[PDB]
Amino acid sequence: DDIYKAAVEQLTEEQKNEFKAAFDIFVLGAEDGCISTKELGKVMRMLGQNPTPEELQEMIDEVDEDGSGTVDFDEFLVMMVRCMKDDSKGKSEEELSDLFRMFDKNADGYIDLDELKIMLQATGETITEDDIEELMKDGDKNNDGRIDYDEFLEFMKGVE
Amino acid sequence: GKRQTEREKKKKILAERRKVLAIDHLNEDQLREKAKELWQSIYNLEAEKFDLQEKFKQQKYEINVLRNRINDNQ
Amino acid sequence: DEDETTALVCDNGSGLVKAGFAGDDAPRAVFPSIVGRPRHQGVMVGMGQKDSYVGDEAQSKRGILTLKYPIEHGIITNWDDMEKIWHHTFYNELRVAPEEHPTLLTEAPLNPKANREKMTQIMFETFNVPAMYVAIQAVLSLYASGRTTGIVLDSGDGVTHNVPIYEGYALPHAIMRLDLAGRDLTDYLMKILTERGYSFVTTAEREIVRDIKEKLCYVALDFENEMATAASSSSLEKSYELPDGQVITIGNERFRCPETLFQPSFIGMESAGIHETTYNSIMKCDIDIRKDLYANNVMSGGTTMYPGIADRMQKEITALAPSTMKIKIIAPPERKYSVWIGGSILASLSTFQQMWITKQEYDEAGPSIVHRKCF
Amino acid sequence: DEDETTALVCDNGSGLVKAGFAGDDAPRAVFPSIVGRPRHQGVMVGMGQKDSYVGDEAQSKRGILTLKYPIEHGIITNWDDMEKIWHHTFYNELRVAPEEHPTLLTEAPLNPKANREKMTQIMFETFNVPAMYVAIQAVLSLYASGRTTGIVLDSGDGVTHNVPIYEGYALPHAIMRLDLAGRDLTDYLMKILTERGYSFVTTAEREIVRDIKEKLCYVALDFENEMATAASSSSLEKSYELPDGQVITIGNERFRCPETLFQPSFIGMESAGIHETTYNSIMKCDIDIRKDLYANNVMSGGTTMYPGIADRMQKEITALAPSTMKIKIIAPPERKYSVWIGGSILASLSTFQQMWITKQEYDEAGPSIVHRKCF
Numbered sequence: 005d006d007i008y009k010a011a012v013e014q015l016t017e018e019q020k021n022e023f024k025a026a027f028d029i030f031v032l033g034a035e036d037g038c039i040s041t042k043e044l045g046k047v048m049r050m051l052g053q054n055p056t057p058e059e060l061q062e063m064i065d066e067v068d069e070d071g072s073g074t075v076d077f078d079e080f081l082v083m084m085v086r087c088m089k090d091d092s093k094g095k096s097e098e099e100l101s102d103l104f105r106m107f108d109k110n111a112d113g114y115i116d117l118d119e120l121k122i123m124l125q126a127t128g129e130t131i132t133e134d135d136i137e138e139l140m141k142d143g144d145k146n147n148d149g150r151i152d153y154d155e156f157l158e159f160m161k162g163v164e
Numbered sequence: 165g166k167r168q169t170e171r172e173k174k175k176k177i178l179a180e181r182r183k184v185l186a187i188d189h190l191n192e193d194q195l196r197e198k199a200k201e202l203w204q205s206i207y208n209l210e211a212e213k214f215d216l217q218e219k220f221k222q223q224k225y226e227i228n229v230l231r232n233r234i235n236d237n238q
Numbered sequence: 239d240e241d242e243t244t245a246l247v248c249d250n251g252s253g254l255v256k257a258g259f260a261g262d263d264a265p266r267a268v269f270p271s272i273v274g275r276p277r278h279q280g281v282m283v284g285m286g287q288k289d290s291y292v293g294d295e296a297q298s299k300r301g302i303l304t305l306k307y308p309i310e311h312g313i314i315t316n317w318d319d320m321e322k323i324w325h326h327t328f329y330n331e332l333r334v335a336p337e338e339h340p341t342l343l344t345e346a347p348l349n350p351k352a353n354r355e356k357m358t359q360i361m362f363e364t365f366n367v368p369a370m371y372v373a374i375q376a377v378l379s380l381y382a383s384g385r386t387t388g389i390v391l392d393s394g395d396g397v398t399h400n401v402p403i404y405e406g407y408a409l410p411h412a413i414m415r416l417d418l419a420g421r422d423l424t425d426y427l428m429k430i431l432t433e434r435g436y437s438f439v440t441t442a443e444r445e446i447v448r449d450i451k452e453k454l455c456y457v458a459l460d461f462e463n464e465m466a467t468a469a470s471s472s473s474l475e476k477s478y479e480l481p482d483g484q485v486i487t488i489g490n491e492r493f494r495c496p497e498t499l500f501q502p503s504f505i506g507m508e509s510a511g512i513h514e515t516t517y518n519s520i521m522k523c524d525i526d527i528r529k530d531l532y533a534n535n536v537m538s539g540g541t542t543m544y545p546g547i548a549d550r551m552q553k554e555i556t557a558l559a560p561s562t563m564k565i566k567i568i569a570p571p572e573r574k575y576s577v578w579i580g581g582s583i584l585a586s587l588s589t590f591q592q593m594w595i596t597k598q599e600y601d602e603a604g605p606s607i608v609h610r611k612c613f
Numbered sequence: 614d615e616d617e618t619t620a621l622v623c624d625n626g627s628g629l630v631k632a633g634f635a636g637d638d639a640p641r642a643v644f645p646s647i648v649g650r651p652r653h654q655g656v657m658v659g660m661g662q663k664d665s666y667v668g669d670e671a672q673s674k675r676g677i678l679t680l681k682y683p684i685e686h687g688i689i690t691n692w693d694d695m696e697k698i699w700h701h702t703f704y705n706e707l708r709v710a711p712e713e714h715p716t717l718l719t720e721a722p723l724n725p726k727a728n729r730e731k732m733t734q735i736m737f738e739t740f741n742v743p744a745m746y747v748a749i750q751a752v753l754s755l756y757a758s759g760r761t762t763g764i765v766l767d768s769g770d771g772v773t774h775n776v777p778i779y780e781g782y783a784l785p786h787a788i789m790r791l792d793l794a795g796r797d798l799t800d801y802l803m804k805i806l807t808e809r810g811y812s813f814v815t816t817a818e819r820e821i822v823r824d825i826k827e828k829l830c831y832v833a834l835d836f837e838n839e840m841a842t843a844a845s846s847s848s849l850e851k852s853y854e855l856p857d858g859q860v861i862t863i864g865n866e867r868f869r870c871p872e873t874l875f876q877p878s879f880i881g882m883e884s885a886g887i888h889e890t891t892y893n894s895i896m897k898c899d900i901d902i903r904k905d906l907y908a909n910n911v912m913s914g915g916t917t918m919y920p921g922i923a924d925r926m927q928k929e930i931t932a933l934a935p936s937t938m939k940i941k942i943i944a945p946p947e948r949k950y951s952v953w954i955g956g957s958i959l960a961s962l963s964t965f966q967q968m969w970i971t972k973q974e975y976d977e978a979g980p981s982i983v984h985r986k987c988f
């Protein structure tokens with residue numbers, strides 16, 4: 005699926021290398037190599053965060069969808085990418101404001117829907133309905149008809 | 165009030181920035197090397213004048229950004 | 239900002255400020271001339287704590303601010319207030335820098351010459367406008383009507399001016415200013431509503447009652463007969479829904495409030511009604527053209543949105559003047575913007591930049607140059 | 614103790630003391646404001662024989678101690694009692710030394726200025742807190758709601774305060790204190806239970822009956838009709854299991870006890886119900902914003918855990934005020950901690966240390982400096 009490679013792309017190499025070499029703190033010998041779900045909470049204490057029963061149980065629910073009682077390495081990477089939200093070691097904002105200038109091609113102060121449609125089709129994918137619809141739900145909150153720099157920053161947080 | 169301050173602050177700034185040449189005594193070769201240097205200086209000044217103009221336009225753009233952030237605020 | 243260096247057009251009308259760009263049909267930033275100031279001192283933190291509040295911000299924050307008028311009947315209180323409101327208009331509302339656009343301004347009729355000299359000097363020092371021109375709102379309303387003959391009744395919020403102009407020429411000898419305006423209207427209505435049981439002093443209720451004047455007020459065709467029939471007048475009596483939700487009912491007061499301008503003896507003015515002021519103005523000048531003045535009278539101002547001024551005007555002038563020639567008033571809809579439109583008209587033609595008041599002329603001759611550059 | 618020098622956040626609410634560290638979500642040490650003293654003298658040895666008993670220790674030792682209130686409706690009895698309870702809170706309960714952490718405290722609305730000056734002076738001399746700040750609980754509850762507009766109903770255990778604040782500005786001219794609170798509730802319930810056959814005077818039964826109020830009490834939708842249908846009401850009548858094991862049954866009293874705040878004439882107050890006190894408070898201020906006050910009312914206090922205040926509140930205000938705009942109350946669960954949360958919020962931002970009340974300012978200007986440093 006595309007979530008596995010998106011998690012690959014949204015996380016830096018040093019972080020994931022340390023994550024895996026440090027997950028290898030539970031394995032000791034003559035083991036399957038994949039530790040029980042609950043032990044995952046313990047590696048998190050090593051990470052420096054102090055999560056809570058609500059998030060812990062939810063996050064537990066975020067692994068092992070098919071119901072094997074065990075976690076693989078790709079689910080491991082997607083959950084880790086889904087845990088700390090400080091992606092890209094802090095997404096920038098200045099060049100991003102330049103990119104805000106980029107979304108707009110009529111120099112008005114905001115992003116028109118037509119400008120979004122041309123921007124999206126310039127990638128190579130055409131327009132489908134769920135695309136723009138979901139992109140609007142992600143970007144906007146009150147039907148203001150445009151994407152300003154706050155909604156701009158919010159929508160793509162962590163994305164490189 | 166401030167009538168002379170602004171004018172002579174500007175003239176003072178342009179005096180420290182620019183360099184004055186005792187052109188009358190300048191020798192043949194000296195006119196050569198210096199008019200080359202002056203033309204190159206004007207070249208660089210126009211270069212980052214154009215840079216200033218562009219970046220003026222973008223700072224206008226971020227004014228646009230912030231003023232729209234304000235008008236939405238009501 | 240437009241790519242072209244077109245001029246700024248700003249009408250600082252006595253009661254409303256309407257600003258925009260030249261070549262535009264309507265002003266972009268239009269706000270009332272009220273200014274709000276923090277009623278108390280600062281102890282809280284995290285938001286607000288700003289001194290000057292202008293425009294719709296102050297309109298929303300009317301209750302928390304002492305509402306003050308930087309100008310009343312032309313008199314200037316504090317130039318800093320104009321400085322701040324012009325800053326707000328140019329940058330927060332017009333999103334324009336005055337460095338690259340000359341300004342055409344309109345001033346109240348017969349404004350002080352000392353006022354002009356001080357305002358121009360503070361303007362030129364504080365701001366960096368390239369060029370200047372200021373004109374009387376009378377000729378601006380004339381331009382909006384586009385007819386060189388007529389007498390202009392400018393009904394601002396501080397003064398009402400009657401100015402005759404024949405074939406595009408000003409007649410200062412027959413120009414008069416009357417101290418009756420919106421302020422008086424609100425005051426008189428305040429005292430009548432006090433006699434109706436509702437007694438308020440603060441400015442929020444001032445705006446509420448001027449809104450009532452905008453919506454429900456009549457101009458009585460016959461005064462005492464209409465109060466006589468307004469004794470009961472269940473149908474004729476009219477009600478308003480105040481924003482708090484209470485229903486406030488008013489009857490004869492609807493046409494007893496504007497009547498005071500016509501009948502100043504209600505609250506004690508030696509001057510008679512404004513129709514008398516137009517009448518005297520007319521006869522002061524040569525007899526012959528007076529008929530044309532009768533037939534070419536124009537009325538201008540935000541108040542003109544009310545009904546009843548036209549019929550009353552014509553009937554009383556016909557009563558005073560002989561009824562041979564037919565008198566008819568002209569008043570285009572939304573004429574409170576008309577002055578600003580005329581400003582755009584001034585910037586339309588290519589001769590207007592022959593007499594821009596540039597920076598160097600002011601630097602040479604000081605403010606005094608305007609004494610020779612405008613008139 | 615945290616390695617960082619973060620501030621102390623302590624809500625000395627009139628009825629509960631909730632203390633902890635800044636940056637925390639909930640106070641760590643929360644105890645009622647009762648204080649127990651030895652009912653008799655010392656002859657035994659080997660254990661106990663300690664004067665002051667505070668917190669859960671006194672709760673367990675309620676029977677053996679005379680239970681006294683160091684504060685009632687804001688009035689201060691003995692500063693030594695506060696000294697001891699603060700010692701207990703800081704060292705035995707919070708395990709913190711006040712030397713290295715500035716303290717943010719919350720005080721009951723409209724507390725005496727002399728009370729503030731004496732408490733601050735004894736505090737600074739007795740303790741070694743580096744810096745100080747004290748604030749009214751009204752703005753703290755506002756911060757917990759996170760909305761600058763609204764009227765706060767603070768229902769403590771000694772006083773109920775109604776305070777309007779519009780756009781984060783206090784309105785002392787429309788703030789009132791009512792002497793009805795938990796004490797009154799317990800008293801009235803005591804007399805009704807006396808008329809039910811059970812007559813107790815001591816404080817243990819006071820806590821039992823306030824627990825009954827916490828568990829079983831109703832707020833009657835219609836009063837006399839509900840006693841009329843509560844005549845028999847086998848299903849509607851509700852019982853409680855007292856810790857001794859006896860089953861005590863109460864019917865209409867469940868909704869006849871909180872009703873007294875709404876109907877003070879039951880035990881003789883000139884002031885009408887607290888809804889009238891919110892109503893008058895609202896009209897005292899300008900008319901226009903009153904609608905917003907109607908729509909932005911907030912209620913705070915430990916009592917708010919009871920059901921029925923919201924429906925009664927809205928219905929009666931809609932009965933008193935016009936029903937055009939919709940009135941809705943907001944009350945987050947577990948709002949008795951909310952004030953303390955707001956204290957943490959105050960320590961969250963980096964501007965808060967600009968106005969810490971340091972030791973040297975107090976040493977220079979005495980206690981009087983607070984008169985200029987807080988307000």
Ligand SMILES: Nc1ncnc2c1ncn2[C@@H]1O[C@H](COP(=O)(O)OP(=O)(O)O)[C@@H](O)[C@H]1O
Nearest residue numbers: 251252253254394395420452539540541543574
């Ligand atoms: N839409 C409207 N309908 C009726 N009256 C209005 C309206 N807008 C403004 N006014 C009145 O016009 C007055 C302001 O007059 P103004 O137009 O500023 O005079 P001037 O033409 O000298 O600038 C205000 O006091 C207000 O009562």
Ligand SMILES: Nc1ncnc2c1ncn2[C@@H]1O[C@H](COP(=O)(O)OP(=O)(O)O)[C@@H](O)[C@H]1O
Nearest residue numbers: 626627628629769770795827914915916918949
């Ligand atoms: N969990 C609870 N449920 C119901 N009522 C409570 C609860 N906890 C405390 N109370 C009531 O709250 C009162 C104390 O109010 P308090 O919260 O101290 O007021 P303030 O908000 O002014 O500090 C006590 O008299 C008690 O009856």
Ligand SMILES: [Mg+2]
Nearest residue numbers: 392393394539
């Ligand atoms: Mg006018």
Ligand SMILES: [Mg+2]
Nearest residue numbers: 767768769914
């Ligand atoms: Mg309380």
